[PDB]
Amino acid sequence: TARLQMVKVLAVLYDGGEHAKQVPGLLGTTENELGLRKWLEDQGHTLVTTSDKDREGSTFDRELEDAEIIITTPFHPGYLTAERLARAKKLKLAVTAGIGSDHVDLDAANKTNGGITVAEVTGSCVVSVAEHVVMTILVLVRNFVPAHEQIEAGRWDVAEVAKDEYDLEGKVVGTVGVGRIGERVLRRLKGFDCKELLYYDYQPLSPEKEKEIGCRRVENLEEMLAQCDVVTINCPLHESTRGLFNKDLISKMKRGSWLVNTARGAIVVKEDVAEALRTGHLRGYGGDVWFPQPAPADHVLRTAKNPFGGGNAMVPHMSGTSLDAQKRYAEGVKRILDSYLSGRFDYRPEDLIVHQGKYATRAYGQR
Amino acid sequence: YTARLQMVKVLAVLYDGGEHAKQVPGLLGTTENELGLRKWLEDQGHTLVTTSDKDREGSTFDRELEDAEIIITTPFHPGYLTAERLARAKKLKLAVTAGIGSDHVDLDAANKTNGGITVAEVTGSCVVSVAEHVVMTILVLVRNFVPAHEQIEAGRWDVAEVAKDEYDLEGKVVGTVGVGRIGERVLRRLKGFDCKELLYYDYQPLSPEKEKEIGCRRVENLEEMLAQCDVVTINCPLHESTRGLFNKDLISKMKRGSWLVNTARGAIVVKEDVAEALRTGHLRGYGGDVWFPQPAPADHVLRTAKNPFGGGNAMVPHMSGTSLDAQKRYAEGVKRILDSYLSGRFDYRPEDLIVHQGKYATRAYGQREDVKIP
Numbered sequence: 001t002a003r004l005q006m007v008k009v010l011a012v013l014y015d016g017g018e019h020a021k022q023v024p025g026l027l028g029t030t031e032n033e034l035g036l037r038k039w040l041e042d043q044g045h046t047l048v049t050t051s052d053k054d055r056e057g058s059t060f061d062r063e064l065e066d067a068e069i070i071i072t073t074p075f076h077p078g079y080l081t082a083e084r085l086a087r088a089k090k091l092k093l094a095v096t097a098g099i100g101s102d103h104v105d106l107d108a109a110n111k112t113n114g115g116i117t118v119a120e121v122t123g124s125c126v127v128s129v130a131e132h133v134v135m136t137i138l139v140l141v142r143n144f145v146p147a148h149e150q151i152e153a154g155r156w157d158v159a160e161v162a163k164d165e166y167d168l169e170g171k172v173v174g175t176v177g178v179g180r181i182g183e184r185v186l187r188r189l190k191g192f193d194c195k196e197l198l199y200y201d202y203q204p205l206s207p208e209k210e211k212e213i214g215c216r217r218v219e220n221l222e223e224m225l226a227q228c229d230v231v232t233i234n235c236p237l238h239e240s241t242r243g244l245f246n247k248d249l250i251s252k253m254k255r256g257s258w259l260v261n262t263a264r265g266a267i268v269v270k271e272d273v274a275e276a277l278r279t280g281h282l283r284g285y286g287g288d289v290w291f292p293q294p295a296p297a298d299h300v301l302r303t304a305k306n307p308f309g310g311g312n313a314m315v316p317h318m319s320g321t322s323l324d325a326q327k328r329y330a331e332g333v334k335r336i337l338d339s340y341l342s343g344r345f346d347y348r349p350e351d352l353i354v355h356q357g358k359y360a361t362r363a364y365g366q367r
Numbered sequence: 368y369t370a371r372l373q374m375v376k377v378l379a380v381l382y383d384g385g386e387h388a389k390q391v392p393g394l395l396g397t398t399e400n401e402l403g404l405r406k407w408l409e410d411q412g413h414t415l416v417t418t419s420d421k422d423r424e425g426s427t428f429d430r431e432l433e434d435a436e437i438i439i440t441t442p443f444h445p446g447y448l449t450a451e452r453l454a455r456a457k458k459l460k461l462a463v464t465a466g467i468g469s470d471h472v473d474l475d476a477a478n479k480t481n482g483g484i485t486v487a488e489v490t491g492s493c494v495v496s497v498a499e500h501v502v503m504t505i506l507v508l509v510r511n512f513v514p515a516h517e518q519i520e521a522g523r524w525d526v527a528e529v530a531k532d533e534y535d536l537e538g539k540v541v542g543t544v545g546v547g548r549i550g551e552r553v554l555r556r557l558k559g560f561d562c563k564e565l566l567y568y569d570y571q572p573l574s575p576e577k578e579k580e581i582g583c584r585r586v587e588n589l590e591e592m593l594a595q596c597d598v599v600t601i602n603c604p605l606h607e608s609t610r611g612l613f614n615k616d617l618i619s620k621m622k623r624g625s626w627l628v629n630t631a632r633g634a635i636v637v638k639e640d641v642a643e644a645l646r647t648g649h650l651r652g653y654g655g656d657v658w659f660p661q662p663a664p665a666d667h668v669l670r671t672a673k674n675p676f677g678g679g680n681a682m683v684p685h686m687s688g689t690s691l692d693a694q695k696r697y698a699e700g701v702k703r704i705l706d707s708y709l710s711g712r713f714d715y716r717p718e719d720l721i722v723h724q725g726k727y728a729t730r731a732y733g734q735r736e737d738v739k740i741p
């Protein structure tokens with residue numbers, strides 16, 4: 001089979017600056033280019049890399065017009081809007097360096113240049129995120145953030161921070177989505193002796209996995225939320241999950257509950273989370289995802305607090321770009337690129353989000 | 368029939384809850400709520416005096432301990448029962464820890480005081496709480512949460528700046544110093560994370576069945592364990608052989624860029640040696656909740672020490688064992704121990720006894736000859 005020739009690749013990655021020289025394991029940066037440059041150039045392909053992706057007349061906007069392959073990364077996402085896809089005359093393959101391709105307009109992608117392939121590195125980040133979720137759950141439940149702030153400020157008052165400190169043992173935790181991340185969340189929670197582990201997903205766990213992990217499927221999302229002390233969101237962003245966690249749905253959670261979101265920022269309504277924390281309906285909110293990204297400097301969830309001055313465990317979009325994750329998605333991006341550039345188009349099916357004008361996943365809504 | 372003891376003076380040293388202890392009545396272990404003991408004691412004809420004033424020359428504690436028959440302390444705000452103080456406690460028969468860890472009592476002096484006083488604590492009451500705190504603090508450090516959260520709250524955004532020290536716990540080697548109630552529960556919670564290996568060092572080993580069930584390996588030499596670990600967690604009591612155990616020389620046996628967690632006792636580490644190991648980047652992180660002394664002085668170096676990248680510090684006040692769920696359990700356990708004494712039965716749970724009848728009654732405070740268990 002004849003290899004494709006002189007393919008223009010465009011990568012939109014985050015700037016590593018000095019950090020990417022201190023730590024060469026920052027592969028997914030404009031400096032280190034996922035370790036792809038020599039590999040592409042030796043085949044006669046070209047690579048243009050940028051972090052300039054937002055402003056009118058950005059490098060991304062100029063370069064996407066004749067790029068055949070566009071590599072994006074969720075942590076600093078080149079948003080492939082319908083407007084931009086309509087100008088991407090040569091685009092055949094959009095690869096996500098990581099997991100979650102919702103920064104691409106997938107419906108528009110299906111109608112672009114005969115239907116472009118949108119692929120991501122399935123599995124590459126999922127342990128990383130699951131760990132981050134259990135971390136965040138513990139941080140919130142155990143009231144870590146204001147306790148650490150008290151120490152660094154030179155103060156000492158045990159009651160002040162113990163008054164909102166609980167154990168995770170004996171609490172009910174529910175996951176929205178029991179895919180590769182949600183399942184691995186429940187597998188990490190098993191040893192904590194939660195009162196119950198619940199899930200809501202239109203794609204269920206097998207009975208054997210339910211028994212092995214020790215968890216129960218709840219058929220109705222609102223019924224799950226009403227029983228949970230902790231809720232974690234582990235579903236993709238698609239039309240039916242955008243703004244899902246609005247004031248009305250959050251009001252179904254228990255008063256004083258904890259909400260974690262390492263999925264996608266746009267699944268929650270940021271003002272509704274901030275208001276629920278402000279009135280004490282939520283005890284805490286945390287995770288690493290925002291909409292848009294970079295998160296605006298004034299984004300309300302940078303500084304929103306519960307009525308006691310805690311309950312915020314937000315970080316930048318980092319869980320899936322741990323140094324261990326980056327090695328896996330850099331290798332996976334090379335693998336997806338080789339499937340295309342070889343002319344084989346022999347993608348792993350689980351890497352495909354849209355392909356040949358159709359959705360190629362069950363996980364972006366019931367279709 | 369056994370004759371109950373009568374008109375017993377109880378002294379409790381607890382932390383002040385102020386307004387917090389009224390906002391949240393679940394703060395049982397406070398000077399306000401008195402572990403729910405006051406009416407229960409008074410109805411039997413006993414008296415209770417409670418204070419948080421325990422440190423200064425001429426403290427309430429120093430005055431009241433002279434004729435207290437029972438002294439209740441709590442690790443989170445510890446009335447230090449020094450040899451000097453025990454020598455002045457002419458009526459003391461029972462010292463009860465509201466929580467776990469009785470190292471704030473001079474146990475050798477306790478064994479020589481008033482014919483050998485009973486020192487009891489509520490074994491098991493806090494152990495889940497602390498084990499969860501350990502795993503939380505391990506993840507916080509390994510995934511570089513603290514500087515990432517600070518970045519967000521300051522209004523900044525730089526993924527690379529905080530990803531460059533962000534690792535997964537999967538594939539890392541974790542070792543625990545001590546595999547008792549807390550250390551075993553730490554390994555039980557780390558099992559789901561697919562660590563490369565789970566190690567322990569303890570002169571009291573796990574059964575072979577529990578080693579296989581949890582999936583962990585006993586390392587016979589402490590330094591050999593430290594050299595193999597990416598993460599070390601200290602889960603042993605404070606006693607003569609563990610005081611200042613984690614000094615510069617022992618820390619130097621840990622890997623460069625390792626993470627150290629201490630929810631056990633502050634005095635097990637040499638604070639200046641931890642700070643220097645963090646500041647030169649031999650440690651990537653240090654965290655936990657325990658200090659020496661407590662309250663931690665305002666200028667304690669581990670409040671503010673950082674790794675060379677401005678992270679690495681996951682310290683909190685002494686709180687893991689005083690979660691609201693723990694407090695319910697140790698408040699009930701203190702009542703149970705008090706009832707064993709006040710009834711004249713002295714029918715303590717053996718596992719609650721640290722010293723009794725002039726002898727250590729535990730194997731967990733060092734390897735001893737003439738350990739006498741009920």
Ligand SMILES: NC(=O)C1=CN([C@@H]2O[C@H](COP(=O)(O)OP(=O)(O)OC[C@H]3O[C@@H](n4cnc5c(N)ncnc54)[C@H](O)[C@@H]3O)[C@@H](O)[C@H]2O)C=CC1
Nearest residue numbers: 099100125177179180181200201203235236262263320363
């Ligand atoms: N914070 C981070 O760095 C990362 C975030 N993610 C995000 O997490 C998402 C999930 O990742 P995986 O678990 O690997 O995907 P997955 O595809 O293995 O599992 C996703 C699951 O969500 C379910 N789902 C879809 N809509 C739902 C709904 N309305 N309610 C409940 N469940 C629903 C699907 O049926 C599927 O079982 C990704 O799509 C991505 O948005 C993933 C990796 C990195």
Ligand SMILES: NC(=O)C1=CN([C@@H]2O[C@H](COP(=O)(O)OP(=O)(O)OC[C@H]3O[C@@H](n4cnc5c(N)ncnc54)[C@H](O)[C@@H]3O)[C@@H](O)[C@H]2O)C=CC1
Nearest residue numbers: 467468493545547548549569571603604630631687688731
């Ligand atoms: N941060 C907090 O709020 C709390 C901290 N603690 C501290 O944790 C300590 C351990 O508690 P548990 O696990 O419940 O006690 P435990 O008695 O069940 O287990 C302690 C284990 O440490 C071992 N040990 C003693 N010296 C050692 C050494 N040099 N090296 C290795 N192992 C050694 C003992 O043999 C024993 O198996 C307590 O004594 C207390 O100091 C416990 C509860 C609350």
